[PDB]
Amino acid sequence: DSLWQSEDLESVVDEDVQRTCILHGPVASQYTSKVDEPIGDILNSIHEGHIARLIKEEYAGDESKIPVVEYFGGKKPASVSATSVNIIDGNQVVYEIDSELPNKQEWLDLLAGTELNWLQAFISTDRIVQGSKHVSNPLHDILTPAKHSKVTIDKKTKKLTAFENIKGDLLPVVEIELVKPNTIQLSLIEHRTADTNPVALPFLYKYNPADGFAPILEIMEDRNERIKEFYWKLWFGSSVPYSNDINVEKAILGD
Amino acid sequence: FLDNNNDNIHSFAVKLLDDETYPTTIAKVKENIVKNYYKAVKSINKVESNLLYHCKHDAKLVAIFGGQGNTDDYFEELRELYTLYQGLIEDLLVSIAEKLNQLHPSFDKIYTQGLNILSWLKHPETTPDQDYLLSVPVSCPVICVIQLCHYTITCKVLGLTPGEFRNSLKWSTGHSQGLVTAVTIAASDSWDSFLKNSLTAVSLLLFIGSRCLSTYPRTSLPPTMLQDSLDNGEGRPSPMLSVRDLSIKQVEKFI
Amino acid sequence: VKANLLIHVLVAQKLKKPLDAVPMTKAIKDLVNGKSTVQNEILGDLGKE
Amino acid sequence: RIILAGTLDSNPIDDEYGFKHEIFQTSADKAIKWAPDWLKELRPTLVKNSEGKIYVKTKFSQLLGRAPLMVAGMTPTTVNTDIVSASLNAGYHIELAGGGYFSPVMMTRAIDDIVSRIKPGYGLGINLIYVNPFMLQWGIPLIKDLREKGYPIQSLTIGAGVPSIEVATEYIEDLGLTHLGLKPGSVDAISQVIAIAKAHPTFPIVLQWTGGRGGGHHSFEDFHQPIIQMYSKIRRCSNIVLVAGSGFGSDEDTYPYLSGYWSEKFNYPPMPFDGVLFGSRVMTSKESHTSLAAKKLIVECKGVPDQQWEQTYKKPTGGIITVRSEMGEPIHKIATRGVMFWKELDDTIFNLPKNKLLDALNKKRDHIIKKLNNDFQKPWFGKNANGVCDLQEMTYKEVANRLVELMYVKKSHRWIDVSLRNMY
Numbered sequence: 001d002s003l004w005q006s007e008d009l010e011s012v013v014d015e016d017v018q019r020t021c022i023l024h025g026p027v028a029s030q031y032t033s034k035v036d037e038p039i040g041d042i043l044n045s046i047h048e049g050h051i052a053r054l055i056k057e058e059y060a061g062d063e064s065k066i067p068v069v070e071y072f073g074g075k076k077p078a079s080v081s082a083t084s085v086n087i088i089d090g091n092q093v094v095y096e097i098d099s100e101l102p103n104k105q106e107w108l109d110l111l112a113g114t115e116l117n118w119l120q121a122f123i124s125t126d127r128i129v130q131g132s133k134h135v136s137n138p139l140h141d142i143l144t145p146a147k148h149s150k151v152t153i154d155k156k157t158k159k160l161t162a163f164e165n166i167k168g169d170l171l172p173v174v175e176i177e178l179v180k181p182n183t184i185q186l187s188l189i190e191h192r193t194a195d196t197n198p199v200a201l202p203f204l205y206k207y208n209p210a211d212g213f214a215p216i217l218e219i220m221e222d223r224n225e226r227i228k229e230f231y232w233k234l235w236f237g238s239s240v241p242y243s244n245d246i247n248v249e250k251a252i253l254g255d
Numbered sequence: 256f257l258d259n260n261n262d263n264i265h266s267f268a269v270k271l272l273d274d275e276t277y278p279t280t281i282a283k284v285k286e287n288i289v290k291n292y293y294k295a296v297k298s299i300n301k302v303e304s305n306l307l308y309h310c311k312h313d314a315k316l317v318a319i320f321g322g323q324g325n326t327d328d329y330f331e332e333l334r335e336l337y338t339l340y341q342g343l344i345e346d347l348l349v350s351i352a353e354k355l356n357q358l359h360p361s362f363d364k365i366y367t368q369g370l371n372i373l374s375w376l377k378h379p380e381t382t383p384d385q386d387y388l389l390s391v392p393v394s395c396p397v398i399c400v401i402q403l404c405h406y407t408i409t410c411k412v413l414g415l416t417p418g419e420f421r422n423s424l425k426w427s428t429g430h431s432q433g434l435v436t437a438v439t440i441a442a443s444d445s446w447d448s449f450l451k452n453s454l455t456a457v458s459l460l461l462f463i464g465s466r467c468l469s470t471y472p473r474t475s476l477p478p479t480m481l482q483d484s485l486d487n488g489e490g491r492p493s494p495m496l497s498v499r500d501l502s503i504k505q506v507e508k509f510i
Numbered sequence: 511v512k513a514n515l516l517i518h519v520l521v522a523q524k525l526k527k528p529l530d531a532v533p534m535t536k537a538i539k540d541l542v543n544g545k546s547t548v549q550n551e552i553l554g555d556l557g558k559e
Numbered sequence: 560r561i562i563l564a565g566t567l568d569s570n571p572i573d574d575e576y577g578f579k580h581e582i583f584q585t586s587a588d589k590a591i592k593w594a595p596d597w598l599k600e601l602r603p604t605l606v607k608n609s610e611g612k613i614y615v616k617t618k619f620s621q622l623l624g625r626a627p628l629m630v631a632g633m634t635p636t637t638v639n640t641d642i643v644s645a646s647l648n649a650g651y652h653i654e655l656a657g658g659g660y661f662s663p664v665m666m667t668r669a670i671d672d673i674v675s676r677i678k679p680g681y682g683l684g685i686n687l688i689y690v691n692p693f694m695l696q697w698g699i700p701l702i703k704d705l706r707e708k709g710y711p712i713q714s715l716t717i718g719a720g721v722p723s724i725e726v727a728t729e730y731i732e733d734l735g736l737t738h739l740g741l742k743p744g745s746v747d748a749i750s751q752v753i754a755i756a757k758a759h760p761t762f763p764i765v766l767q768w769t770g771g772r773g774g775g776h777h778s779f780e781d782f783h784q785p786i787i788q789m790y791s792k793i794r795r796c797s798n799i800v801l802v803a804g805s806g807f808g809s810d811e812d813t814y815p816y817l818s819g820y821w822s823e824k825f826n827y828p829p830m831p832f833d834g835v836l837f838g839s840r841v842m843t844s845k846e847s848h849t850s851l852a853a854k855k856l857i858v859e860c861k862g863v864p865d866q867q868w869e870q871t872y873k874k875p876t877g878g879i880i881t882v883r884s885e886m887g888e889p890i891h892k893i894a895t896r897g898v899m900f901w902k903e904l905d906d907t908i909f910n911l912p913k914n915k916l917l918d919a920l921n922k923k924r925d926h927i928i929k930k931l932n933n934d935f936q937k938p939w940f941g942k943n944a945n946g947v948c949d950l951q952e953m954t955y956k957e958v959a960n961r962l963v964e965l966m967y968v969k970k971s972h973r974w975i976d977v978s979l980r981n982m983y
């Protein structure tokens with residue numbers, strides 16, 4: 001156990017460092033010269049040293065020649081021997097599907113598109129931050145391929161709308177679009193109610209371009225009240241307004 | 256069997272290995288498929304899909320040429336080539352061996368067992384032991400025959416004149432022995448010019464073959480030495496010794 | 511279950527050798543042969559067991 | 560690309576080189592199986608973010624979403640919930656040192672100090688140590704359900720040993736990590752990581768290569784030579800991210816390691832590294848809990864070039880010697896008086912077998928007691944009437960007052976441990 005004293009030399013015989021063991025490396029010591037510089041400013045000052053060399057060597061001293069992306073991360077560098085012909089980007093798209101073409105994992109790549117944006121992020125991020133969590137992606141299984149389905153992506157990925165066949169008719173069940181700036185609204189539609197009026201479940205996902213490991217963080221504020229107003233329309237109907245001031249102690253009358 | 260790759264039986268041969276209906280061996284694939292195709296085929300003078308080098312900035316071909324002593328049993332490569340690709344090279348090596356027999360009696364009394372290669376292929380019982388075959392006046396012409404067949408066949412499987420197959424190559428070189436086949440390769444153009452320069456190659460290495468044995472004749476070795484060399488994990492002693500795993504600066508510290 | 515029959519059983523499946531191949535006289539260190547992750551895993555399994 | 564045009568018996572299982580048919584294929588763009596060029600394919604490039612800040616896009620940076628410069632998880636170093644916190648807030652990756660936590664109640668209390676303080680969306684790793692099978696008895700069942708609770712612990716680096724393949728499957732398949740770090744020390748340890756990546760082809764593996772010139776428990780092999788024999792078949796696994804560490808502290812130092820121009824010292828192709836981890840560089844930082852007089856000592860210790868780190872086994876080289884641990888494997892430490900005294904007992908007493916152990920301690924006794932009191936951090940307990948002594952010649956009151964002297968910090972009014980308070 002001779003080890004913890006390094007950060008607690010005050011509680012040792014006569015606070016003499018010699019009396020103690022400090023684990024350190026022989027070649028690493030010639031770079032450690034100035035004391036109590038912050039742990040950011042150590043790693044920032046040597047990252048920007050690598051940037052300024054790689055600007056000068058490979059980019060001719062120009063910062064504008066550097067490629068620019070919206071977010072950085074998420075797309076796998078591990079390229080297997082796979083057919084890149086079936087990677088399809090489009091402008092104003094419908095994607096009908098039957099039993100064979102395609103399978104699951106490349107269907108998410110068709111709905112991504114080659115250009116980096118919020119929809120490519122939201123279709124293909126492994127994680128959605130739910131108030132400092134990292135839980136699984138909701139679109140990654142609800143957009144699983146199925147028979148007689150089709151999705152609709154129009155005018156440079158600004159709205160994804162997914163269809164599936166019910167009772168012969170074909171109606172929207174999933175809608176993803178941008179709402180008030182830099183926020184995704186996943187509108188998840190339920191059709192079969194008391195008076196066949198479609199009702200949708202409003203989700204709010206915030207998009208963060210600065211973080212690329214988890215670009216889309218779910219707004220957990222006011223989430224339970226959004227989900228309850230949806231079920232209030234289902235179990236009761238739109239004829240009764242949403243009232244959440246139910247006293248718990250009193251008995252609940254029916255009809 | 257060959258859909259839109261109708262002149263690609265070489266890759267068709269190795270795709271047959273991958274099946275589980277076929278128990279995998281290469282011996283029943285080389286013959287029974289690739290032997291019998293080139294046995295049955297008419298004129299292969301069909302210049303196939305040569306667009307690989309036509310994008311000149313992106314692909315650069317080099318034919319490279321082995322030397323003396325890459326394997327112990329070297330003549331069985333010419334056995335399997337004559338068994339398989341027989342109609343492709345029969346006009347070639349008959350013209351070779353007729354020149355060798357016109358140059359064979361002038362170096363008698365040092366290799367008495369003949370240099371009749373065409374007898375050694377058509378009649379395997381007429382072949383000497385490999386200790387005569389691995390000797391230098393034998394192996395230096397015949398390795399030049401092996402290298403001039405794999406250039407002949409690659410020109411004839413693709414159906415190319417060697418003067419324009421040489422156009423697909425950027426540069427070429429040879430090792431210890433096969434440098435004469437690299438200068439054969441740039442001098443040959445058509446089918447008539449290639450034979451005239453190949454005969455000057457195989458006749459050349461009959462002089463490199465005979466005079467390097469007539470200058471340094473291998474004498475008998477003490478059986479203490481070679482039995483020690485087999486028991487130490489080394490090879491049977493010969494005038495060239497390969498040292499692996501050591502730098503050039505420290506091997507010359509040992510010599 | 512006895513200690514002698516316990517350690518042997520767990521070790522037998524770890525070394526993928528016949529139960530007789532592992533003599534209970536010696537130690538795991540000398541039984542493994544030198545592997546840094548071999549001896550560590552062996553003890554780890556028993557440690558949590 | 561080598562095309563063996565004489566023989567037709569493709570395919571080799573590793574697909575290093577081609578055979579006869581690859582000359583002949585008449586498909587237009589499907590005929591040409593290219594050779595991997597390491598200088599073009601995995602060179603470090605730059606990229607701007609949408610906010611205009613510039614990153615170095617490597618293969619390690621693309622998986623993490625941040626700069627290719629992580630802080631390696633050390634026992635004593637990575638233990639201050641604060642060094643792992645505000646370096647993640649700088650935007651840099653850190654694995655938490657699992658070795659200084661001893662119960663899953665204490666570590667889950669510690670992880671909650673990070674997650675409450677780092678930005679919503681950042682993640683940390685957990686550096687465990689494979690030669691502590693007690694810590695894997697509670698730490699690995701902790702990571703399985705704590706990730707099922709959904710905490711931001713995103714990776715698990717296993718130091719001091721590469722697991723077997725049936726164990727590393729359970730570390731990948733069940734508990735939901737983003738990527739997994741491995742720290743090989745030998746070529747058989749590197750080729751065991753390649754055995755893991757070919758078992759799980761789509762999951763990232765961060766192969767952390769450290770040489771013997773690092774700090775902490777060392778290694779015998781050289782830094783350059785094992786990967787220079789193995790870089791060819793690491794890169795045939797597209798999931799393995801290769802990270803080099805062990806002695807990196809400046810931008811001019813490790814830029815030849817990212818770019819790959821270091822192997823033209825060795826007459827070899829350029830061999831770029833994906834990422835760079837820091838060990839002993841981060842210890843003198845402001846937000847570490849290394850003592851202030853201990854940080855000044857590291858500053859005073861000038862380093863050693865790479866050409867002469869092998870003489871650390873004999874002499875203080877820049878003030879740092881290796882020394883033998885409890886179970887034999889070496890440990891790089893700074894060369895104070897107590898660590899030089901650690902080596903004096905290693906060459907003389909601790910290498911002896913059991914039959915000469917009790918006799919050597921009897922003849923060396925008052926000399927050992929001399930420098931446990933003077934030089935070493937764990938003193939000799941016996942102290943009667945200001946004279947050093949044996950334990951059985953102390954009264955009970957001066958036994959107890961010596962326990963208050965050696966376990967209670969009177970300047971800060973706290974114990975070293977509660978379990979030492981429960982001893983007194």
Ligand SMILES: Cc1cc2nc3c(=O)[nH]c(=O)nc-3n(C[C@H](O)[C@H](O)[C@H](O)COP(=O)(O)O)c2cc1C
Nearest residue numbers: 025028631633634718773774775805806807838839
């Ligand atoms: C103070 C200190 C504590 C360390 N603790 C650990 C540990 O708990 N587990 C581990 O696998 N490596 C540990 N290391 C080794 C480093 O993670 C890394 O391999 C080495 O420091 C890199 O060498 P460098 O400091 O010269 O760059 C430690 C190194 C230092 C200097």
